[PDB]
């Protein structure tokens, strides 16, 4: 991570003595907590899925993951959200099959 000590190149910049400052707590925002995981599991167990997720599950089972990703991209925002949603539906069907 050290700079090369010249003005042009891949790690250009002055060669200084780094410090790696103490991480801020605000950088811990994406971290899952036991409280929120417990609440979310209980809430999903008491609420249940939505029509587009039901369609996604049946699409994964019958048509396939590529078509599921296409429809999830259409429903949700983007490809990253579609990927996360289709993988989540894969988790759901895995849990359903196991028990």
């Amino acid at each position: 991570t050290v700079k090369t000590g010249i003005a042009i190149g891949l790690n250009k910049g002055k060669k200084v003595t780094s410090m790696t400052p103490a991480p801020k707590i605000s950088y811990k925002k994406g971290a899952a907590s036991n409280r929120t995981k417990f609440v979310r599991s209980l809430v999903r167990e008491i609420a249940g899925l939505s029509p587009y997720e039901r369609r996604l599950i049946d699409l994964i089972r019958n048509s396939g993951e590529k078509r599921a990703r296409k429809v999830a991209k259409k429903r949700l925002g983007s490809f990253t959200r579609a990927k996360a949603k289709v993988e989540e539906m894969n988790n759901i069907i895995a849990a359903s099959r196991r028990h």
Binding site: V39, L42, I46, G48, L49, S50, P51
Partner: protein, 203 residues
């Protein structure tokens, strides 16, 4: 700790329970008055998050506003204007349905101050909001410095001046490069960068 459960459940807008509740509650609100007093918030967690506290001087008002575009309120067709301004139908109001909801609520309850508002329901014709208001003259708010800031005259009709959350969002009041036109105020910025500044010794 039921508020966490309430909020997580509310996020699941498309579940069977929430669809059923949405149907029945939207019918009930449609059958009630356009602006009416709500005895309690239907989303206590949302109200507390937005600043409502279950104490005397805090009130909740339910309001519904018509959805859709803002049709230009002038036929006669006689604008003698340019084709760029000729459009009538697909024009959009620059303030949110939330903003007009709380403006109507504040005009109705002009003795209170609009603290906040949130979305509760919607159908094709209407959107439904609940407005949290505070009484600046109740002593339970005038004392107890946690909320007496709103009893100062500078907060008269925050909903009208666009100082609520929806108002600031619509005004564009945000930090960053994407809001260079609207950070300190659109018109203030325009005036500052269209002023001709002349010093005694001309620079």
């Amino acid at each position: 700790g039921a508020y966490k459960y309430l909020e997580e459940l509310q996020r699941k807008k498309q579940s069977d329970v929430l669809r059923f509740l949405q149907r029945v509650r939207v019918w009930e609100y449609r059958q009630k008055n356009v602006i009416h007093r709500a005895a309690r918030p239907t989303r206590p967690d949302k109200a507390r998050r937005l600043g409502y506290k279950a104490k005397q001087g805090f009130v909740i008002y339910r309001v519904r506003v018509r959805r859709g575009n803002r049709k230009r309120p002038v036929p006669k067709g006689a604008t003698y204007g340019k084709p760029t301004n000729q459009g009538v139908n697909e024009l959009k109001y620059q303030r949110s349905l939330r903003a007009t909801a709380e403006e109507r609520v504040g005009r109705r309850a002009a003795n209170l101050r609009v603290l906040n508002s949130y979305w509760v329901n919607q159908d094709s014709t209407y959107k439904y909001f609940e407005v949290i208001l505070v009484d600046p003259q109740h002593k339970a708010i005038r004392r107890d410095a946690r909320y007496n800031w709103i009893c100062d005259p500078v907060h008269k009709h925050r909903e009208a001046r666009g100082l609520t959350a929806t108002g600031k969002k619509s005004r564009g009041i945000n930090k960053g490069h994407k809001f260079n036109n609207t950070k300190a105020g659109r018109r203030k910025t325009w005036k500052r960068q269209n002023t001709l500044s002349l010093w005694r010794y001309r620079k």
